[PDB]
Design a protein around this ligand. Structure first.
Ligand SMILES: [Mg+2]
Ligand SMILES: [Mg+2]
Ligand SMILES: [Mg+2]
Ligand SMILES: [Mg+2]
Ligand SMILES: [Mg+2]
Ligand SMILES: [Mg+2]
Ligand SMILES: [Mg+2]
Ligand SMILES: [Mg+2]
Ligand SMILES: [Mg+2]
Ligand SMILES: [Mg+2]
Ligand SMILES: [Mg+2]
Ligand SMILES: [Mg+2]
Ligand SMILES: [Mg+2]
Ligand SMILES: [Mg+2]
Ligand SMILES: [Mg+2]
Ligand SMILES: [Mg+2]
Ligand SMILES: [Mg+2]
Ligand SMILES: [Mg+2]
Ligand SMILES: [Mg+2]
Ligand SMILES: [Mg+2]
Ligand SMILES: [Mg+2]
Ligand SMILES: [Mg+2]
Ligand SMILES: [Mg+2]
Ligand SMILES: [Mg+2]
Ligand SMILES: [Mg+2]
Ligand SMILES: [Mg+2]
Ligand SMILES: [Mg+2]
Ligand SMILES: [Mg+2]
Ligand SMILES: [Mg+2]
Ligand SMILES: [Mg+2]
Ligand SMILES: [Mg+2]
Ligand SMILES: [Mg+2]
Ligand SMILES: [Mg+2]
Ligand SMILES: [Mg+2]
Ligand SMILES: [Mg+2]
Ligand SMILES: [Mg+2]
Ligand SMILES: [Mg+2]
Ligand SMILES: [Mg+2]
Ligand SMILES: [Mg+2]
Ligand SMILES: [Mg+2]
Ligand SMILES: [Mg+2]
Ligand SMILES: [Mg+2]
Ligand SMILES: [Mg+2]
Ligand SMILES: [Mg+2]
Ligand SMILES: [Mg+2]
Ligand SMILES: [Mg+2]
Ligand SMILES: [Mg+2]
Ligand SMILES: [Mg+2]
Ligand SMILES: [Mg+2]
Ligand SMILES: [Mg+2]
Ligand SMILES: [Mg+2]
Ligand SMILES: [Mg+2]
Ligand SMILES: [Mg+2]
Ligand SMILES: [Mg+2]
Ligand SMILES: [Mg+2]
Ligand SMILES: [Mg+2]
Ligand SMILES: [Mg+2]
Ligand SMILES: [Mg+2]
Ligand SMILES: [Mg+2]
Ligand SMILES: [Mg+2]
Ligand SMILES: [Mg+2]
Ligand SMILES: [Mg+2]
Ligand SMILES: [Mg+2]
Ligand SMILES: [Mg+2]
Ligand SMILES: [Mg+2]
Ligand SMILES: [Mg+2]
Ligand SMILES: [Mg+2]
Ligand SMILES: [Mg+2]
Ligand SMILES: [Mg+2]
Ligand SMILES: [Mg+2]
Ligand SMILES: [Mg+2]
Ligand SMILES: [Mg+2]
Ligand SMILES: [Mg+2]
Ligand SMILES: [Mg+2]
Ligand SMILES: [Mg+2]
Ligand SMILES: [Mg+2]
Ligand SMILES: [Mg+2]
Ligand SMILES: [Mg+2]
Ligand SMILES: [Mg+2]
Ligand SMILES: [Mg+2]
Ligand SMILES: [Mg+2]
Ligand SMILES: [Mg+2]
Ligand SMILES: [Mg+2]
Ligand SMILES: [Mg+2]
Ligand SMILES: [Mg+2]
Ligand SMILES: [Mg+2]
Ligand SMILES: [Mg+2]
Ligand SMILES: [Mg+2]
Ligand SMILES: [Mg+2]
Ligand SMILES: [Mg+2]
Ligand SMILES: [Mg+2]
Ligand SMILES: [Mg+2]
Ligand SMILES: [Mg+2]
Ligand SMILES: [Mg+2]
Ligand SMILES: [Mg+2]
Ligand SMILES: [Mg+2]
Ligand SMILES: [Mg+2]
Ligand SMILES: [Mg+2]
Ligand SMILES: [Mg+2]
Ligand SMILES: [Mg+2]
Ligand SMILES: [Mg+2]
Ligand SMILES: [Mg+2]
Ligand SMILES: [Mg+2]
Ligand SMILES: [Mg+2]
Ligand SMILES: [Mg+2]
Ligand SMILES: [Mg+2]
Ligand SMILES: [Mg+2]
Ligand SMILES: [Mg+2]
Ligand SMILES: [Mg+2]
Ligand SMILES: [Mg+2]
Ligand SMILES: [Mg+2]
Ligand SMILES: [Mg+2]
Ligand SMILES: [Mg+2]
Ligand SMILES: [Mg+2]
Ligand SMILES: [Mg+2]
Ligand SMILES: [Mg+2]
Ligand SMILES: [Mg+2]
Ligand SMILES: [Mg+2]
Ligand SMILES: [Mg+2]
Ligand SMILES: [Mg+2]
Ligand SMILES: [Mg+2]
Ligand SMILES: [Mg+2]
Ligand SMILES: [Mg+2]
Ligand SMILES: [Mg+2]
Ligand SMILES: [Mg+2]
Ligand SMILES: [Mg+2]
Ligand SMILES: [Mg+2]
Ligand SMILES: [Mg+2]
Ligand SMILES: [Mg+2]
Ligand SMILES: [Mg+2]
Ligand SMILES: [Mg+2]
Ligand SMILES: [Mg+2]
Ligand SMILES: [Mg+2]
Ligand SMILES: [Mg+2]
Ligand SMILES: [Mg+2]
Ligand SMILES: [Mg+2]
Ligand SMILES: [Mg+2]
Ligand SMILES: [Mg+2]
Ligand SMILES: [Mg+2]
Ligand SMILES: [Mg+2]
Ligand SMILES: [Mg+2]
Ligand SMILES: [Mg+2]
Ligand SMILES: [Mg+2]
Ligand SMILES: [Mg+2]
Ligand SMILES: [Mg+2]
Ligand SMILES: [Mg+2]
Ligand SMILES: [Mg+2]
Ligand SMILES: [Mg+2]
Ligand SMILES: [Mg+2]
Ligand SMILES: [Mg+2]
Ligand SMILES: [Mg+2]
Ligand SMILES: [Mg+2]
Ligand SMILES: [Mg+2]
Ligand SMILES: [Mg+2]
Ligand SMILES: [Mg+2]
Ligand SMILES: [Mg+2]
Ligand SMILES: [Mg+2]
Ligand SMILES: [Mg+2]
Ligand SMILES: [Mg+2]
Ligand SMILES: [Mg+2]
Ligand SMILES: [Mg+2]
Ligand SMILES: [Mg+2]
Ligand SMILES: [Mg+2]
Ligand SMILES: [Mg+2]
Ligand SMILES: [Mg+2]
Ligand SMILES: [Mg+2]
Ligand SMILES: [Mg+2]
Ligand SMILES: [Mg+2]
Ligand SMILES: [Mg+2]
Ligand SMILES: [Mg+2]
Ligand SMILES: [Mg+2]
Ligand SMILES: [Mg+2]
Ligand SMILES: [Mg+2]
Ligand SMILES: [Mg+2]
Ligand SMILES: [Mg+2]
Ligand SMILES: [Mg+2]
Ligand SMILES: [Mg+2]
Ligand SMILES: [Mg+2]
Ligand SMILES: [Mg+2]
Ligand SMILES: [Mg+2]
Ligand SMILES: [Mg+2]
Ligand SMILES: [Mg+2]
Ligand SMILES: [Mg+2]
Ligand SMILES: [Mg+2]
Ligand SMILES: [Mg+2]
Ligand SMILES: [Mg+2]
Ligand SMILES: [Mg+2]
Ligand SMILES: [Mg+2]
Ligand SMILES: [Mg+2]
Ligand SMILES: [Mg+2]
Ligand SMILES: [Mg+2]
Ligand SMILES: [Mg+2]
Ligand SMILES: [Mg+2]
Ligand SMILES: [Mg+2]
Ligand SMILES: [Mg+2]
Ligand SMILES: [Mg+2]
Ligand SMILES: [Mg+2]
Ligand SMILES: [Mg+2]
Ligand SMILES: [Mg+2]
Ligand SMILES: [Mg+2]
Ligand SMILES: [Mg+2]
Ligand SMILES: [Mg+2]
Ligand SMILES: [Mg+2]
Ligand SMILES: [Mg+2]
Ligand SMILES: [Mg+2]
Ligand SMILES: [Mg+2]
Ligand SMILES: [Mg+2]
Ligand SMILES: [Mg+2]
Ligand SMILES: [Mg+2]
Ligand SMILES: [Mg+2]
Ligand SMILES: [Mg+2]
Ligand SMILES: [Mg+2]
Ligand SMILES: [Mg+2]
Ligand SMILES: [Mg+2]
Ligand SMILES: [Mg+2]
Ligand SMILES: [Mg+2]
Ligand SMILES: [Mg+2]
Ligand SMILES: [Mg+2]
Ligand SMILES: [Mg+2]
Ligand SMILES: [Mg+2]
Ligand SMILES: [Mg+2]
Ligand SMILES: [Mg+2]
Ligand SMILES: [Mg+2]
Ligand SMILES: [Mg+2]
Ligand SMILES: [Mg+2]
Ligand SMILES: [Mg+2]
Ligand SMILES: [Mg+2]
Ligand SMILES: [Mg+2]
Ligand SMILES: [Mg+2]
Ligand SMILES: [Mg+2]
Ligand SMILES: [Mg+2]
Ligand SMILES: [Mg+2]
Lengths: 97, 147
RNA sequence: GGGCCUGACUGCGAGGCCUGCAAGCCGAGCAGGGGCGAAAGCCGGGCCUAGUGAACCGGUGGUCCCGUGUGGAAGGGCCAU
RNA sequence: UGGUGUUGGCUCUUGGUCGCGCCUGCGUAGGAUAGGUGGGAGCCUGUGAACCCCCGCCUCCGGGUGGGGGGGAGGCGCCGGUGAAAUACCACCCUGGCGCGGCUGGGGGCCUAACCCUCGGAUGGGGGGACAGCGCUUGGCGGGCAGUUUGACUGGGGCGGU
RNA sequence: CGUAGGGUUAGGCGGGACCUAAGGUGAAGCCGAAAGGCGUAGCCGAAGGGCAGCCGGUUAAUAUUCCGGCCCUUCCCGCAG
RNA sequence: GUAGGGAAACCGAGUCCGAACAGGGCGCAGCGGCCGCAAAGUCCGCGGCCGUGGACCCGAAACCGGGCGAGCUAGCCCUGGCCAGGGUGAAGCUGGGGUGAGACCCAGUGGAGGCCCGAACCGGUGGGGGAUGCAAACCCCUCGGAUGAGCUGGGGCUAGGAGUGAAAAGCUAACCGAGCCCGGAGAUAGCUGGUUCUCCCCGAAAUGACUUUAGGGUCAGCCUCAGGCG
RNA sequence: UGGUUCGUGGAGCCAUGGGGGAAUCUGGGCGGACCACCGCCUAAGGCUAAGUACUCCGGGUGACCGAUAGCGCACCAGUAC
RNA sequence: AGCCGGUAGCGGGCGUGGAUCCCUGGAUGUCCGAAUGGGGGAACCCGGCCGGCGGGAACGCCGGUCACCGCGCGCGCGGGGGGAACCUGGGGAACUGAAACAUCUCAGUACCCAGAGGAGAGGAAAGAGAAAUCGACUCCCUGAGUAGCGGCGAGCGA
């Protein structure tokens, strides 16, 4: 319920629009709005744990950008990552974005 | 999802083959256990350039062995021994033929490859396969003679 | 009471009644195509006064007026309900 | 609460669909049980015949069709009976059914590795487990809360009446 | 009360250079559009724990604080065991 | 502004409805002896009144946003403190009795309890006083609890549709059925009030219709001013 | 869902939380559903003066005020209270 | 050619060898504050390390230095906080109006928050939209209360 670390996808505000009535195209009198109230639409945030340079790195990422994580690992094969901490590996992974 | 198998897995495919499986299978079983790699375009050339290079080293064996099948099959290794009538007092071994094909005719050869279980204990004219590479077996004519 | 019928018209409408508005009401006459009558003529529902509901939004039939570069189409307008 | 994403493996079982083997098709008339349109004036037998009997299957009650054995070489069409179409043989497809497969819909069972819980030990063990949680979406219940509405005349107002 | 001058003296009294309580804060970590919310340790947090001074005299005004008497604590250095 | 008519296509001093060349709707138009001159229309000034805006001025009860408050009060948490004196005399214990052993009875010991009387302390029952008070809750007399669900110091946490409540919609800083401050903000008020020099001419209405209208409005009626008619 | 004049409307365009998910100019997006024709334009990387806004500050100028006015404050005022 | 602020006085001084005073630069600048050694009830308290001072080891004082985060190959550069309005972005009411009220309006306004700078934003066409046309963006005038949107109501408005 926050921020995709790969895409930057963020919780956005949306309206919930309650309607009644038969649509004009169905031959009806037309749609009437019985209510409009704000709500939030969240990214489909999921945990993705991967191993890089021996250490275990966790990403909080929207489902839409899950393959972008595994790509970052392949692109991380050509980096001097050995011996760094997980916090340091993550920064190097995201730097390759 | 397309992947490149690193190993032959039952009813899945052969090593180095590009198969298509479900995302979760590849992400939470195969790729973590080293059983397959993502069929990305980048390492899809890595696969291709191994298929390429491995075929190159092999056809270089089948065309270096062929040149060694030209020198042999077009000569005869005459071997002089001490022999009584037909039985030899000593024996001519594959090692002997090799060390014979050295000093004579110039070609050094691998003894352990020649097809000869027991040492030759009689005179005559023998036809001995070499096999420096399968499907390329060199027939060598070796003539055991006395004195 | 009976005969033939569909004027329980279409296109209009001088002139008025009533009246704050918007409505309601009466209407001769002209044309189109008719009904009845020999004809003069009558006929635009019903002896009369109640039996009703402005807009908006939408349905249906027709019209073929608009059609977002152009031809169409979507969707509207108009007449009728 | 349905669909769907995160969400995967194996199997069994029913469903649907194509691929393939296929086999199934019953009037009067007409050999007999004629799926249809073409191709068709021939195919078939040491890829052993007319037929004797044991085996499943299909039986509109004739059979049909699949094996096996004996024997081991002739049998059906073209003709005509014949019907709307009429026959050996070769394709395309039609009915329905079955089997091996695709590819998926449900269902049952099991797995583990996502995900969740846990364990002085943690690139691990244990438990749950593709469920639950969570994201998008569907319909529902919903004074827990929120915004409001709840007409006028009237011998005051309400009540009644209008 | 107005103006001015003077008056509050501590190693031992109370607080701090000690400790922890609720609670607050908060490396690690978790969460949230932003602001921020949480959070084991640790830190802060007292009138609780801990810790060595009694009696008398003196000033216009301070006194376990100055003075007198008799005591005591910690730190540093050194000596001896 | 110089062209209008039609939903429009379009036509145009016409156009629209229509079969119409019918009828109707809406449209189409200076004075003198070329010039003055008066004029479409238009520009600017000025004045009346209307629309928009807080719109003549002052006034709500309220609604919303962001902060500020538990030094009062409510509850809890941590850590300390306090409760004279007297009375009642549970269990247990011991001894005696009792019995097959017991139950149990009696005396002594004992010291329990949202036990009793009563100060401190915590309350606030009835009456009187007070009522521009000593006091925006006080005073006198009386009265309830006073080892407990007791009282109290210090240190803390919980708050506004929220807290806390042995529950009274009580309390959350002397007015709480939704705190306070600042902001939206000059909210809105068809209601009440108020509206400031002088003189001159005219001079009403309180009806009708309709109205979630009835003490408010739109139109008409009635008043007034300018132009015109006569 | 939002933005736009567009409140579901025939609803395109621009943006995007969810699902699916391409191509490299013979590719692609747009001209208000959609299709054809004809044109326009090159998304998914970034930067870029000037013309524009404001007035704590400085100056200049008022058919602006003149101590109940003009800033809340002409004065020791964000003060006393 | 006077001067030691408002500020006179007391008691003392300074200036044509150029004072006071005005401008520019520099020096000094206690303690708190982003506040940053640590703590904290701002302006107080308590430390480590190196150097100095005292008879100085205990004690105290003086100078230097020591927060956290980001970025780069232990050392560097950067960040933090503030500013009257103005700006952009992320969130975002209600009274009110519709003579009731819910869609709608008030309004993407008030306000909160993040960031920016002397401005900010936008900006070099996957534009416009019918001109066989134009040629980044910003801003003013106009187009125009037009086109349209709208319980086709109130209103909104390119
Ligand atoms: Mg919804
Ligand atoms: Mg519709
Ligand atoms: Mg339609
Ligand atoms: Mg609607
Ligand atoms: Mg998650
Ligand atoms: Mg995962
Ligand atoms: Mg998506
Ligand atoms: Mg996807
Ligand atoms: Mg009659
Ligand atoms: Mg009759
Ligand atoms: Mg007739
Ligand atoms: Mg008339
Ligand atoms: Mg009338
Ligand atoms: Mg009537
Ligand atoms: Mg009528
Ligand atoms: Mg006639
Ligand atoms: Mg006639
Ligand atoms: Mg006639
Ligand atoms: Mg006749
Ligand atoms: Mg006639
Ligand atoms: Mg007539
Ligand atoms: Mg009648
Ligand atoms: Mg009659
Ligand atoms: Mg009648
Ligand atoms: Mg109507
Ligand atoms: Mg309406
Ligand atoms: Mg309509
Ligand atoms: Mg039509
Ligand atoms: Mg047309
Ligand atoms: Mg068109
Ligand atoms: Mg065409
Ligand atoms: Mg056309
Ligand atoms: Mg057509
Ligand atoms: Mg049409
Ligand atoms: Mg009609
Ligand atoms: Mg659901
Ligand atoms: Mg799923
Ligand atoms: Mg299981
Ligand atoms: Mg398991
Ligand atoms: Mg497990
Ligand atoms: Mg289990
Ligand atoms: Mg699930
Ligand atoms: Mg759905
Ligand atoms: Mg729902
Ligand atoms: Mg309800
Ligand atoms: Mg309610
Ligand atoms: Mg309201
Ligand atoms: Mg109502
Ligand atoms: Mg009602
Ligand atoms: Mg009502
Ligand atoms: Mg009433
Ligand atoms: Mg009455
Ligand atoms: Mg009456
Ligand atoms: Mg009365
Ligand atoms: Mg009365
Ligand atoms: Mg009633
Ligand atoms: Mg005094
Ligand atoms: Mg003195
Ligand atoms: Mg002393
Ligand atoms: Mg001490
Ligand atoms: Mg010390
Ligand atoms: Mg301390
Ligand atoms: Mg401590
Ligand atoms: Mg952190
Ligand atoms: Mg915290
Ligand atoms: Mg804690
Ligand atoms: Mg400490
Ligand atoms: Mg402490
Ligand atoms: Mg203490
Ligand atoms: Mg103590
Ligand atoms: Mg002490
Ligand atoms: Mg002592
Ligand atoms: Mg003295
Ligand atoms: Mg004294
Ligand atoms: Mg003294
Ligand atoms: Mg002493
Ligand atoms: Mg020693
Ligand atoms: Mg017109
Ligand atoms: Mg006419
Ligand atoms: Mg017409
Ligand atoms: Mg006329
Ligand atoms: Mg003139
Ligand atoms: Mg004029
Ligand atoms: Mg007016
Ligand atoms: Mg206003
Ligand atoms: Mg006003
Ligand atoms: Mg006005
Ligand atoms: Mg309200
Ligand atoms: Mg309300
Ligand atoms: Mg409310
Ligand atoms: Mg608040
Ligand atoms: Mg208190
Ligand atoms: Mg309290
Ligand atoms: Mg305690
Ligand atoms: Mg206690
Ligand atoms: Mg206590
Ligand atoms: Mg007591
Ligand atoms: Mg007692
Ligand atoms: Mg007692
Ligand atoms: Mg006692
Ligand atoms: Mg006793
Ligand atoms: Mg006892
Ligand atoms: Mg006893
Ligand atoms: Mg006893
Ligand atoms: Mg007692
Ligand atoms: Mg006693
Ligand atoms: Mg009690
Ligand atoms: Mg008691
Ligand atoms: Mg008692
Ligand atoms: Mg006492
Ligand atoms: Mg009390
Ligand atoms: Mg008290
Ligand atoms: Mg009291
Ligand atoms: Mg009480
Ligand atoms: Mg009393
Ligand atoms: Mg009494
Ligand atoms: Mg009393
Ligand atoms: Mg008395
Ligand atoms: Mg009284
Ligand atoms: Mg009294
Ligand atoms: Mg009183
Ligand atoms: Mg009293
Ligand atoms: Mg008393
Ligand atoms: Mg008493
Ligand atoms: Mg008493
Ligand atoms: Mg009692
Ligand atoms: Mg008592
Ligand atoms: Mg007592
Ligand atoms: Mg008692
Ligand atoms: Mg107690
Ligand atoms: Mg207490
Ligand atoms: Mg307390
Ligand atoms: Mg306190
Ligand atoms: Mg609480
Ligand atoms: Mg609170
Ligand atoms: Mg608060
Ligand atoms: Mg409130
Ligand atoms: Mg509030
Ligand atoms: Mg409520
Ligand atoms: Mg509540
Ligand atoms: Mg209570
Ligand atoms: Mg207050
Ligand atoms: Mg109160
Ligand atoms: Mg009260
Ligand atoms: Mg109030
Ligand atoms: Mg309220
Ligand atoms: Mg409220
Ligand atoms: Mg209060
Ligand atoms: Mg404020
Ligand atoms: Mg306002
Ligand atoms: Mg007001
Ligand atoms: Mg109101
Ligand atoms: Mg006035
Ligand atoms: Mg008069
Ligand atoms: Mg009247
Ligand atoms: Mg009316
Ligand atoms: Mg009515
Ligand atoms: Mg009425
Ligand atoms: Mg009324
Ligand atoms: Mg009345
Ligand atoms: Mg009224
Ligand atoms: Mg009037
Ligand atoms: Mg008159
Ligand atoms: Mg008049
Ligand atoms: Mg006149
Ligand atoms: Mg969409
Ligand atoms: Mg919208
Ligand atoms: Mg529409
Ligand atoms: Mg749209
Ligand atoms: Mg829309
Ligand atoms: Mg799109
Ligand atoms: Mg998206
Ligand atoms: Mg192209
Ligand atoms: Mg293309
Ligand atoms: Mg596009
Ligand atoms: Mg398009
Ligand atoms: Mg375009
Ligand atoms: Mg188009
Ligand atoms: Mg373009
Ligand atoms: Mg490009
Ligand atoms: Mg830019
Ligand atoms: Mg320039
Ligand atoms: Mg600039
Ligand atoms: Mg600029
Ligand atoms: Mg300027
Ligand atoms: Mg100025
Ligand atoms: Mg003046
Ligand atoms: Mg003056
Ligand atoms: Mg004054
Ligand atoms: Mg003043
Ligand atoms: Mg004066
Ligand atoms: Mg000033
Ligand atoms: Mg003032
Ligand atoms: Mg003043
Ligand atoms: Mg003052
Ligand atoms: Mg002075
Ligand atoms: Mg002097
Ligand atoms: Mg002097
Ligand atoms: Mg000089
Ligand atoms: Mg300076
Ligand atoms: Mg100093
Ligand atoms: Mg400082
Ligand atoms: Mg500090
Ligand atoms: Mg600190
Ligand atoms: Mg030192
Ligand atoms: Mg020293
Ligand atoms: Mg220092
Ligand atoms: Mg230091
Ligand atoms: Mg900041
Ligand atoms: Mg800033
Ligand atoms: Mg800044
Ligand atoms: Mg914004
Ligand atoms: Mg942001
Ligand atoms: Mg927003
Ligand atoms: Mg904003
Ligand atoms: Mg809100
Ligand atoms: Mg509202
Ligand atoms: Mg308002
Ligand atoms: Mg209005
Ligand atoms: Mg308004
Ligand atoms: Mg209203
Ligand atoms: Mg109203
Ligand atoms: Mg109301
Ligand atoms: Mg409203
Ligand atoms: Mg709006
Ligand atoms: Mg503002
Ligand atoms: Mg500039
Ligand atoms: Mg810029
Ligand atoms: Mg470019
Ligand atoms: Mg114009
Ligand atoms: Mg708007
Ligand atoms: Mg404009």
């Amino acid at each position: 319920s926050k921020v995709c670390e790969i895409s930057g996808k963020r919780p956005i505000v949306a309206n919930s629009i309650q309607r009644r009535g038969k649509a004009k195209r169905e031959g009806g009198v037309g749609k009437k709005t019985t209510g409009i109230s704000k709500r939030r639409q969240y990214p489909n945030l999921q945990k993705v744990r991967v191993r890089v340079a021996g250490q275990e790195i966790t990403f909080r990422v929207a489902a839409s950008h899950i393959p972008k994580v595994y790509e970052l690992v392949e692109r991380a094969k050509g980096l001097k990552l050995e011996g760094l901490s997980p916090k340091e590996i993550k920064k190097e992974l995201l730097k390759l974005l | 999802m397309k992947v490149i198998l690193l190993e032959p897995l039952e009813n899945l495919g052969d090593v180095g083959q590009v198969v298509d499986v479900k995302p979760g299978y590849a992400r939470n079983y195969l790729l973590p256990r080293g059983l397959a790699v993502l069929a990305t375009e980048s390492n899809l050339k890595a696969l291709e350039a191994r298929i390429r290079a491995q075929a190159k080293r092999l056809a270089e064996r089948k065309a270096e062995a062929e040149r060694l099948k030209e020198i042999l099959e077009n000569l005869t290794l005459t071997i002089p021994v001490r022999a009584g009538e037909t039985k030899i007092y000593g024996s001519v071994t594959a090692k002997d033929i090799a060390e014979a094909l050295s000093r004579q005719h110039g070609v050094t050869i691998d003894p352990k490859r020649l097809a000869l279980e027991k040492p030759i204990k009689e005179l005559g004219e023998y036809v001995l396969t070499y096999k420096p590479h399968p499907e390329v077996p060199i027939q060598l004519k070796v003539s055991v003679v006395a004195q």
